[PDB]
Design a protein around this nucleic acid. Structure first.
Ligand code: ZN
Ligand code: ZN
Ligand code: ZN
Ligand code: ZN
Lengths: 100, 1189, 130
RNA sequence: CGCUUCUCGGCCUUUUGGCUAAGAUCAAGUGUAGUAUCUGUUCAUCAGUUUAAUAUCUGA
RNA sequence: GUAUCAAGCUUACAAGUUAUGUAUUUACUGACCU
């Protein structure tokens, strides 16, 4: 996301797998992280949607509730037609809070 | 400021064409892409003609178009890849007549990029996988399956990434229930770019690579990669499995290649050239088409080269291994980009420029007389197998599909003294070129003529029975002459026939089976075979006014109005009703219509009155002689018509200035009258029959036919003069037609072309028609014709003499001098057999003065071999008298790649006397090509290229007066308005130049900020300047309000001028606009900018009146961007902001797709806009009625 | 006045405003005020703080489409081969973002590069006319 | 002309009063990523490294 | 504590100097986070 710069996206080819969002991150965009104007469904690869990784949120990796969306600001900038925006790594956020 | 886009005649040049069973039936249909337009065509086999059923705007460029058949399926599906990263699969539904978007899938970013796929496409013929491919680095594979709702399913895109690798053409290999293979030409270039020695880029030859899709393992692997000692361009699928030797054919320069892996060797066949044709200094020869065909016994390929020579490629193998390949010369056609050979003997060739053609296969196989050779026979010294071209033997000309592409230059002019203006369009490339005059009417063709004297008022049409076609009699009456002519041969006045009554006749009709009802002063006739007349019609005195005709029921009136019926009995003779209204008169006209079912009265009465009123009444025996619904009209109707045109009863009154269009319905009458205009004599609205349905001809100062072409209400005029009357016609001389004369003659008319709008009439040409000008006195045209790689006919005769010389010189002791003289005296038509090509660097050009009425070679001035014309303008100088002058810019040794010119010339011509010939005056030299001539203040301005020069006449040569050198790279066009000079750069933009009167200086004072690659221009106002580019944009630049002209002349502002102009609109079309002109297309309308594109499309930009219309159409297009998305997946706002962003322009072509959807979306958009869909459709068509055709 | 202000927080918030505005008025004919504000956004490229550089990078990729890629490319020019590396790599990555955002729109927007002694740098295809 | 006294003005503490038990009591926050700014602080001639140009090292 | 709007009660009467490095705070940003 844009909030934590150490997070990297997956950026592989997108299939027909519809992305999901958890109850904590419902309505959030993936790139710009906004709440308004949904336009495009989120398509992720088959490696990030397989086995125990199905029905899973994109950002936090929790259980998905609603469908994931792109904003119109990401649509007219065409940040939806790039690689699959699945956040893989988790660093310096929600990790050291587990140890504290 | 605020403009509105509307197309009139859409795109006609075909880039891709496919054939298949798209409707789901046994017959086959064509799907073509016009680049921007997607069309479906049906080759009707019984008549041979072509009827377009659906044409849609995908709002993008169609870079890949290919159909596939599903495994175990009947209907063929369409795969479209475009500039966007949305691959779409389409299915044609014949019920709702729309391309159903089956699946739209994302595979990458948009735009015509190098990285993202869309450029080339391949599919497995069984219908299991499809590969979309770019030029470089990625090829994506979709797996096609079907699930239990008989529904298509598509999995994830498989990857075939290969960095630093070009892709030349991709094709699918037909395998029988095997892992599908895709063949493509690849080339590695990293050793070509890392090595500066240059020779590493010469031995980097092509590699054919096979990609095998393991459906069991779900990946793409490089299976085979075999090199090529030649360079190929595209490939051809060979059908296999249980059909034959499954493989790919490789077309290459002077060669055709078979490869198939494992054990079959590389079978090579050199391509046959012509005997001694004068186009081969060192050139090669490639293909342009494949045209595979499987006739269920064997399979062949109707390949096409770049000259139009069709080659019959047929594989014959004894074993499963290939033995040898062979081909032969089939036919000659104009050069086509794609073919679609069809079942039951049809071949549709889609030319890259000019008209398209449909031929019928008359003699397939053709293995009887032609001396054909093969590949594996030991032939040496090149190809060694030649052929002589021949006229048509295997194909016959059936359909000539009209196409205005390429529109290279266009003018709106009134040279033919018509009320409406005409379009003068340059078209074609090379020998197939034509100047085409375009009108607004329809193709009315004459078949016969007669010499009926006096002053006839009307002509009525009647048959023997309802089922026949001969239409036994045709009657013509004015006051007292009967004159009921025979319809067939030997048209002449008649004696007392079986249907004739008396002389003063006034109407005829067929009421019964063979019973004719005819009306005259002693009115009632009822004649079938016995003259059973009952001519009472006596309420004392009045007997002659106001007949009206239906086929089952009768209304006639007297001085009065609502009066007697005089029906017939179903098994007997006539009867009458005694219920009369007696109607204090006020009568002008009556006209009705009837429905084909009905054992009742089953019609609707329409009467018009002298006062500002009409009256429509249903006269059923319940509610009889009681008025139903009322009226309103301004002045007087003087005409009526009732019509049913659909597959709602369309009430049409018409008045002496305009016509209306109601929507009358049978229990209740909701009219909803559409309005339109037409000396302005009183109109006549008459019912005729075309195509199987009926239509209305409303006639005025000119005629106007209103027909329903799939519920679109086309009200298009006719091309002739005023004809004062209309009536139907049917015979064996012409099946359907309209006899329509009340003025001193008689003709037989026919309406052949009905679906289109414009009237193409073509005048043939020799070379490419670059541009032309208009002579205002004694209207003629002066055109320049210029082709690169072409000879002039004197050099052609010298080259043919040289050919004859070496044919009689090379070993003539053993002799055939008949061959040389036979090549000399036989001049082939270059428009059919293809024009000869003059190597590299030759520039053929002529100048043609033409009468645009008849279209004859009124004057022709030839040039030499390396001399090309690029600019021409007529003018009248100030130092001399009234005599005209023609300035022609000619270039010599221009050679294009790389550009290094060797100086040019400017020719001056006198144009004596009235413009019928053209005499040479003088020839001045110049250092660079003068591609721009402009008359200004009695002199000429010429853009040499970085140099703008003002010239004056001299008796020896032209003399300059000024010179400017601060202008940029190269001049592309100069247009003047008075006190200002608009200079078009070939690269950046417009430049404003001021010419001084006291001095002679050319001082620049204003420029623009955007590079545009400007091609053509037009002047709208004193400040606003419009322009277009090579890419497809339309821009309008408007100056700031101050912009002081008085600038007397070192720092600039940003490397140029200082008064930077602003842009009020940028717009994208997708096609190169080559002629912009501000004019008014109809008398009584208003001004609108007419742009004519490159691929045959013609559009207009329309100004808005007030801000509420701009706001309403902006909301219409904003709602249709969300409710009705385009077909290729390209976003409409992103396509109209393709290069430059859109600014204050509403695409009305998206707005006119409101009438093509279901009424659910129409109801949603109309209730969001607080209107009704008829009101929205009327507000939409007000702009096309007022400002357009 | 926000982009004229001395603090960088005002300028990064104003770059966010101009970004969301450019994503708001896209296709409406309001390119003059955006070209006015980008003349103040563009000297703020030189900042090295991550938040302000991602804010102005979002502003540049938002103004890439509204006023056109032509004005963005003209702003990138005479800054590609600049000898200071600190401006050089940042202008090259801005050119990379414009290249990946809209490649084909830049095709009509390229300037002319004349020929050297050996190679051919002229696009001869767009140079000739009919 | 100088000196003492008085009156008027230009003005440099004015805080809401004083007293009872100073009248009696009160005032919690993190953890992550990054940036700006104060205090403290200190700044002999060739050759190449490096740098837009500058500013560390080896040399006599 | 106030400025208007009746009944309660009251006489029913008199009457023509930029800058570096670091020890080190103060603030600021990312809709950062159970
Ligand atoms: Zn989440
Ligand atoms: Zn977003
Ligand atoms: Zn992924
Ligand atoms: Zn040291």
């Amino acid at each position: 996301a844009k909030h934590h710069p150490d997070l990297i996206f997956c950026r592989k080819q997108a299939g027909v797998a519809i992305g999901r969002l958890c109850e904590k991150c419902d309505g959030k965009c993936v790139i710009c992280d906004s709440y308004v104007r949904p336009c495009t469904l989120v398509r992720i690869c088959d490696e990030c949607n397989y086995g125990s990784y199905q029905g899973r949120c994109v950002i936090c990796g929790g259980p998905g509730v609603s469908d994931a969306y792109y904003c119109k600001e990401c649509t007219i900038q065409e940040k939806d037609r790039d690689g699959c925006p699945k956040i893989v790594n988790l660093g310096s956020s929600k990790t050291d809070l587990f140890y504290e | 400021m605020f403009l509105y886009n509307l197309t009139l005649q859409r795109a006609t040049g075909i880039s891709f064409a496919i054939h298949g069973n798209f409707s789901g039936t046994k017959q086959q249909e064509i799907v073509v892409s016009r680049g921007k337009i997607l069309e479906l065509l049906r080759p009707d086999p019984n008549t041979g003609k072509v009827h377009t059923l659906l044409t849609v705007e995908v709002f993008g460029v169609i870079r890949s178009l290919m159909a596939f058949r599903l495994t175990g399926g009947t209907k063929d599906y369409i795969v479209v890849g475009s500039d966007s990263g949305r691959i779409v699969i389409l299915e044609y539904q014949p019920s709702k007549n729309m391309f159903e978007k089956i699946h739209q899938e994302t595979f990458g970013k948009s735009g015509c990029r190098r990285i993202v796929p869309g450029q080339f496409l391949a599919v497995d013929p069984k219908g299991r996988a499809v590969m979309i491919s770019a030029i470089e680095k990625q090829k994506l594979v979709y797996i096609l399956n079907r699930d239990a709702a008989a529904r298509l399913t598509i999995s994830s895109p498989l990857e075939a990434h290969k960095a630093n690798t070009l892709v030349y053409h991709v094709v699918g290999v037909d395998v029988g229930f095997e892992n599908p293979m895709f063949a493509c030409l690849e080339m590695d270039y990293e050793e070509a770019d890392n090595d500066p020695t240059g020779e590493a880029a010469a031995n980097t030859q092509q590699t054919l690579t096979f990609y095998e899709l393991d459906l069991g393992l779900n990946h793409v692997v490089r299976k085979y990669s075999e090199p090529l000692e030649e360079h190929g361009n595209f490939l051809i699928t060979v059908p296999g499995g249980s059909d034959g030797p499954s493989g790919v054919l490789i077309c290459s320069e002077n060669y055709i290649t078979y490869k198939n892996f494992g054990d079959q060797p590389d079978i090579r066949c050199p391509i046959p050239r012509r005997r001694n044709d004068l186009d081969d200094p060192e050139r090669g020869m490639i293909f342009v088409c494949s045209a595979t065909h499987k006739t269920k016994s064997m399979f062949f390929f109707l390949a096409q080269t770049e000259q139009g020579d069709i080659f019959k490629i047929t594989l014959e193998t004894d074993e499963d291994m290939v033995t040898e390949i062979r081909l032969k010369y089939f036919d000659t056609v104009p050069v086509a980009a794609a073919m679609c050979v069809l079942k039951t003997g049809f071949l549709f060739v889609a030319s890259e420029f000019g008209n398209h053609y449909l031929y019928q296969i008359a003699h397939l196989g053709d293995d009887d007389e032609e001396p054909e050779f093969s590949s594996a026979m030991p032939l040496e010294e090149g190809d060694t197998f030649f052929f002589q071209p021949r006229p048509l033997k295997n194909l016959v000309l059936v359909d000539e599909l009209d196409s205005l592409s390429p529109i290279l230059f266009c003018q709106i002019a009134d040279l033919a003294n018509e009320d409406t203006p005409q379009l003068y369009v340059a078209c074609g490339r090379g020998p197939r070129s034509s100047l085409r005059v375009l009108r607004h009417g329809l193709e009315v063709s004459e078949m016969a003529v007669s010499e009926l004297p006096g002053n006839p008022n009307a002509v009525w049409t009647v048959r023997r029975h309802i089922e026949d076609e001969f239409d036994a009699y045709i009657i013509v009456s004015f006051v007292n002459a009967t004159l009921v002519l025979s319809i067939g041969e030997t048209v002449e006045e008649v004696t007392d026939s079986g249907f004739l009554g008396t002389t003063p006749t006034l109407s005829c009709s067929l009421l019964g089976d063979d019973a004719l009802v005819q009306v005259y002063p002693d009115g009632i006739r009822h004649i079938r075979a016995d003259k059973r007349v009952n001519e009472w019609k006596t309420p004392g005195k009045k007997t002659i006014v106001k007949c009206a005709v239906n086929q089952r029921q009768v209304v006639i009136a007297l001085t009065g109005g609502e009066l007697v019926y005089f029906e017939m009995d179903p098994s007997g003779q006539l009867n009458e009703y005694t219920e009369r209204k007696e109607m204090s008169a006020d009568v002008v006209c009556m006209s009705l219509a009837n429905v084909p079912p009905g054992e009742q009265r089953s019609r609707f009465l329409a009467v018009g009155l002298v006062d500002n009123t009409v009256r429509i009444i249903s006269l059923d025996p319940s509610d009889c002689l009681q008025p139903l619904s009322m009226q309103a009209l301004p002045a007087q109707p003087e005409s009526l018509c009732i019509v049913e045109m659909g597959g709602f009863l369309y009430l049409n009154i018409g008045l002496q200035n305009g016509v209306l269009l109601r929507t009358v319905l049978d229990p209740v009458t909701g009219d909803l009258s559409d309005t339109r205009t037409r000396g302005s004599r009183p109109v006549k609205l008459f019912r005729v029959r075309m195509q199987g349905q009926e239509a209305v001809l409303a006639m005025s100062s000119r005629s106007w036919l209103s027909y329903s072409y799939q519920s679109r209400f086309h009200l298009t005029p006719l091309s002739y003069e005023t004809l004062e009357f209309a009536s139907g016609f049917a015979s064996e001389q012409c099946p359907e037609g309209i006899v329509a004369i009340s003025t001193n003659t008689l003709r037989i008319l026919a309406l052949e072309k009905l679906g289109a709008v414009f009237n193409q009439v073509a005048f043939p040409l020799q070379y490419t028609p670059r541009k032309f000008v208009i002579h205002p006195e004694s209207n003629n045209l002066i055109i320049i014709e210029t082709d690169h790689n072409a000879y002039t006919e004197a050099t052609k005769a010298q080259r043919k003499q040289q050919m004859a010389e070496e044919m009689v010189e090379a070993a003539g002791e053993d002799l055939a001098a008949e061959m040389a003289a036979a090549f000399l005296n036989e001049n082939l038509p270059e428009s059919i057999f293809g024009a000869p090509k003059a190597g590299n660097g030759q520039w053929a050009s002529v100048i043609r003065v033409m009468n645009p009425i008849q279209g004859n070679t009124l004057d022709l001035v030839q040039l030499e071999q390396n001399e090309a014309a690029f600019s021409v303008a007529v003018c009248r100088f100030s130092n001399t008298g009234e005599d005209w002058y023609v300035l022609v810019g000619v270039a010599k040794d221009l050679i294009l790649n790389p550009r290094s010119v060797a100086g040019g010339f400017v020719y001056t011509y006198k144009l004596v006397n009235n413009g019928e010939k053209l005499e040479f005056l003088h020839k001045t030299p110049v250092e660079e090509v003068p591609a721009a001539i402009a008359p200004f203040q009695g002199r000429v301005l010429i853009g040499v290229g970085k140099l703008l020069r003002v010239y004056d006449l001299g008796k020896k040569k032209l003399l300059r007066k000024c010179e400017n050198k601060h202008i940029a790279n190269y001049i592309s066009g100069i247009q003047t308005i008075g006190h200002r000079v608009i200079v078009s750069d070939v690269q950046e933009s417009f430049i404003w130049v001021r010419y001084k009167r006291n001095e002679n200086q050319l001082i620049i004072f204003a420029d623009d900020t955007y590079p545009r690659w400007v091609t053509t221009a037009s002047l709208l106002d004193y400040d606003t300047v419009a322009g277009a580019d090579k890419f497809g944009n339309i821009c309008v630049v408007r100056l700031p309000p101050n912009t002081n002209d008085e600038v007397d002349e070192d720092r600039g502002l940003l490397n140029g001028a200082s008064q930077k102009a602003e842009v009020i609109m940028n717009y994208h079309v997708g096609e190169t606009v080559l002629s912009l002109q501000k004019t008014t297309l109809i008398p009584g309308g208003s001004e609108s900018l007419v742009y004519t594109t490159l691929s045959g499309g013609i559009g207009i930009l329309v100004p808005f009146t007030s801000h509420e219309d701009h706001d309403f159409f902006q909301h219409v297009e904003m709602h249709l961007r969300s409710e009705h998305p385009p077909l290729c997946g390209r976003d409409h706002l992103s396509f109209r902001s393709y290069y430059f962003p859109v600014k204050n322009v509403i695409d009305g072509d998206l707005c006119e797709q409101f009438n093509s959807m279901e009424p659910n979306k129409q109801k949603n958009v109309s209730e969001e806009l607080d209107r009704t869909p008829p009101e929205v459709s009327k507000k939409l068509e007000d702009i096309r009625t007022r400002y357009a055709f | 006045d926000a982009l004229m202000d001395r603090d960088l927080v005002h300028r990064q918030t104003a770059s966010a405003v101009v970004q969301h505005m450019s994503l708001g008025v896209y296709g409406f004919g309001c390119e003059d005020s955006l070209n006015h504000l980008l003349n103040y956004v563009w000297p703020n490229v030189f900042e090295t703080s991550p938040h302000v550089i991602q804010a102005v990078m979002g502003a540049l990729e938002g103004l890439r489409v509204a006023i056109g890629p032509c004005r963005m490319l003209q702003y990138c020019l005479q800054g590609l081969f600049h000898p200071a590396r600190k401006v050089r790599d940042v202008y090259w990555k801005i050119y990379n973002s414009i290249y990946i955002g809209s490649q084909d729109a830049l095709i009509a927007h390229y300037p002319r590069i004349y020929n050297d002694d050996k190679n051919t740098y002229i696009r001869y295809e767009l140079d000739y006319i009919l």
